[PDB]
Design a protein around this nucleic acid. Sequence first.
RNA 1: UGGAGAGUUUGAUCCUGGCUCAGGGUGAACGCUGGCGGCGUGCCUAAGACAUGCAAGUCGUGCGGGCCGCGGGAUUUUACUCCGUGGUCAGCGGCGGACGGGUGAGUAACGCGUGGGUGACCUACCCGGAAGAGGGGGACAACCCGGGGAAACUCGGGCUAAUCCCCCAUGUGGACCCGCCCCUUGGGGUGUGUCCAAAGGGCUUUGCCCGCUUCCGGAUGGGCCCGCGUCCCAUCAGCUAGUUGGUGGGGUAAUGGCCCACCAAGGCGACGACGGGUAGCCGGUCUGAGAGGAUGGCCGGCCACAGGGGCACUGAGACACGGGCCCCACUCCUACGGGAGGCAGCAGUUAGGAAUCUUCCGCAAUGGGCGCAAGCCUGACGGAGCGACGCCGCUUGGAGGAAGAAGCCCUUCGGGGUGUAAACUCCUGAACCCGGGACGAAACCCCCGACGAGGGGACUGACGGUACCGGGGUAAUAGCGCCGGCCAACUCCGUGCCAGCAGCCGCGGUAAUACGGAGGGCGCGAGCGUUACCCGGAUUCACUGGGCGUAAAGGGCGUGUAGGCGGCCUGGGGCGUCCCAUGUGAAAGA
Lengths: 208, 99, 99, 83
Amino acid sequence: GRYIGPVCRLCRREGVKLYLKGERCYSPKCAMERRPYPPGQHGQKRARRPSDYAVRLREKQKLRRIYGISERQFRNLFEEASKKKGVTGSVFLGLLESRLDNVVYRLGFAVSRRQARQLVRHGHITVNGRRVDLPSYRVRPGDEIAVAEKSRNLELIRQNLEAMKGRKVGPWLSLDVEGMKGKFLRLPDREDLALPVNEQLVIEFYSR
Amino acid sequence: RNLSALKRHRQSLKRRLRNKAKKSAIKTLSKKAIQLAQEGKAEEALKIMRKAESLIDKAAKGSTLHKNAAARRKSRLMRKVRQLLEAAGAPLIGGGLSA
Amino acid sequence: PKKVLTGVVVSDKMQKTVTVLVERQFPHPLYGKVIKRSKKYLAHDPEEKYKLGDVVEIIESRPISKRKRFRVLRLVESGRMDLVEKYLIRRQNYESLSK
Amino acid sequence: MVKIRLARFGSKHNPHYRIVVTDARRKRDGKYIEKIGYYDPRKTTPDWLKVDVERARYWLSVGAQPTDTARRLLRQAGVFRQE
RNA sequence: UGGAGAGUUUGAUCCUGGCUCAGGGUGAACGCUGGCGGCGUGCCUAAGACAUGCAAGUCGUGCGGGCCGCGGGAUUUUACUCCGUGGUCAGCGGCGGACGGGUGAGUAACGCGUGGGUGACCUACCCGGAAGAGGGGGACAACCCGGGGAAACUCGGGCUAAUCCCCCAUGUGGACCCGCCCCUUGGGGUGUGUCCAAAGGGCUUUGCCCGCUUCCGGAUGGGCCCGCGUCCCAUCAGCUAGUUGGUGGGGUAAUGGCCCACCAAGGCGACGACGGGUAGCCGGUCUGAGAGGAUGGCCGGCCACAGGGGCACUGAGACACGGGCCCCACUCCUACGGGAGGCAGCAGUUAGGAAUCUUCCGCAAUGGGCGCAAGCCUGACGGAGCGACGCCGCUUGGAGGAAGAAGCCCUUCGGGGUGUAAACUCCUGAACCCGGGACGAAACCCCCGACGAGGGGACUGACGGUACCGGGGUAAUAGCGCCGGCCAACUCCGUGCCAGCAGCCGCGGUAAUACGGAGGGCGCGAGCGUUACCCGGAUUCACUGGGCGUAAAGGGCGUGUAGGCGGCCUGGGGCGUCCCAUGUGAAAGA
Ligand SMILES: [Mg+2]
Ligand SMILES: [Mg+2]
Ligand SMILES: [Mg+2]
Ligand SMILES: [Mg+2]
Ligand SMILES: [Mg+2]
Ligand SMILES: [Mg+2]
């Protein structure tokens, strides 16, 4: 599954900073500072006036590329969201936002989603104490998301969790910094997220 | 290649034979009775009917003629006999008929 | 409940039997319009009683022949030779349809 | 001779039986006359045995034989326990 | 909670209109590629042919033997004989072999679906209730002695047991005829008359267990019948002699031309008979905004078939896949007379084919057959194995890291690109190694109690040293398609109407974003493409929802048959239509 290749490289093309590295994509480039244009031989020749289609494509590309979840998986989540009760555009967001790998990152245990995903695969995370190694794991509200006491030692867990000492966190989350753990309070309201992304267009890409 | 329940066959044959046999009596005896009534025979034609009746009932004790194929035969027979006797004169002596 | 059908007698040309035309009508599954449709039944009339042009009720019955499976329950009204007329002409149209 | 017996639902390495009255001659997982309970041998849930005992008593009343292991479950839910 | 359209007829336009693409699906196959797991799934073709093993038995608590043992007795003389017991082999006798499992050939039909009927019926084992088992008699295998055959086998003679067969009794009762009563298709009740029961076995032995007989009910399972529904062709229009009905038989568990005799002359069809083609039907499945279209593989239900064609026997049940008989076609044995056989059971072989699995492991679980039980049988089944065939989860790293190596590609020779990508620093640690290690299994049974209720006890795991838990631990796989427009993605060479591309429109004739290569780019990712097929879009068969002056389409015109349609008022009825209740609509699926 999952991407694996040049990255603060779509921080590019998709036209806008995705923090996919995070740690660096904050400081003289998401690559996106030095060259704010599409990749490849042609990427700074005069923009082609893009089609109604193109537009819708890129936009979903953008959104998906942010959580680095794969097309297959992304699509399933969307269809899930459609058939579900309530405003489908939003719910979808709620749902992507419930993936453990994302929440691990939203809580700050890692500095990126790709790094966050690894901490999940490698047993470093718990949910309500019991261990969980699925990035795709669906976090529901009331769930407690711990660092694994056995993992609490490593230079990484240290550095990132220390970094959090000053830091503020998601209205829909809570985070006790000392005891290396978070709570997932509620699923995020569209407003709570600041995503560089117009979801109504994504819905539109899954019409025709 | 040797299924020992072809024993079932062996018995089936024995049973086939025992049945065949009982039934043959029943037929040949009924014939006899209705033939005798066709000739107006108080004593002798019932005397025989009465045997045939019995022989049928017995047949229905086990597998031969079970049921009310029994009952059918009895009915058909004691109709046939009864009618044939009033179709000539003479009514009386003995027998399995309610007068 | 044994089905009860009501129709018109269009044949007494058989002993102890009548042919009864039962019309039925309903909405057509796809096209909506209420359409008519009918069926002849051969019904049991043991006292050769009902005649050409009677409207009768017909009742679901223990079989009498291959195709006799209804008995004539009662009579609704006599006379209706228009209905028989309708059937008969429709029947004769048929010659004027081959080669 | 009709039967109270087990009927295999669930999946592979995931048995869940249904406790059913059915004709003796019918296939294991086939058409039954009534469901009257269930049973999860691996006890994965608090809810691992359940039996409609009024119903179990009816079918017994009309003479259905439980399997040996069906009756085991039946007894455990107190079908036979009297006074 | 639901509905997107685009390309292509012209110099241009509007319109008709077809073709084509974008989406979804599949038991797939094919190409390039291919790491791990769970759960599904896998002969769509020849219902062709099949080597081999296995797929249905079991009961010694129904019965008597044969063969191999062992042990006791009678006689004190050793031969002969009685009893007990262990193997083992069939036989008689039971219950099962009609289930389970396989296939879709045939079937356009009461086959299926759905709703009803049976006063026209059956149901072994199970449950409940009423009442019984008292006398006699007989035979056939086994075993023994003969004969025929190469073999399959087979003919005769003699002995014998029983829960095997018969006879008499008893008749709770039931059956039948006739009558009468109620009820109404053959449903109950009643009276003469007649007829009909049984089997024994075990013992923890006078009192229990397993059985037997008659009958009334229950339960489950089935037969038969009926209304409605169920594909294409009218370039198939007439069809029919058991034909349609009757009366009387026969036959069945039971109705019925189901069959037969006799009589009558009828039955069916444009609302599509008859004929031809195709086809198992459904629950469902896929698609669609829906109406609809398409479909019926896995799973569940029904049906039908067991090399092809007949047919009956036995039985509660079969006209019986692993029973029987005959005809036919094939294969095998044959001493040429005769015989054996039937994977559309699990594996497997071979043939056909674009294509479809292991001659595996286990009865541990569930379920089934016999058994009082212990148990035995169970290729049903529970698992494992092969295949990216499908779905789902996971990996091929994470954070740093230059105004930015080399190489390669572009270049107005300044430079621009691949690119934070690599290198390189730290970090984590798929795989792999070590240690522990399941649930699935508590019953049958035994003990206590009372063989009940209830309590106590023991045996048992194919999967499997697997899942899962703990410890250790290596930076560790990327491919395929596409970049003229529709359609997301552009440049240099090569090539010169060639070689080639191509879903449609169309590219190529020396400057090709369309061919081939390369840099770069878009898309998806253990996959990606291709081909085939289904629905979509297609309001392009238009019910929802189309049309016919010139686009395809008004019949050359009438007459009027069936049929369709029918002004205004009032009344009955209540068929259509509408409403309330109620039954039905299994499970799976949704
Ligand atoms: Mg053109
Ligand atoms: Mg033109
Ligand atoms: Mg042009
Ligand atoms: Mg067009
Ligand atoms: Mg048109
Ligand atoms: Mg024209």
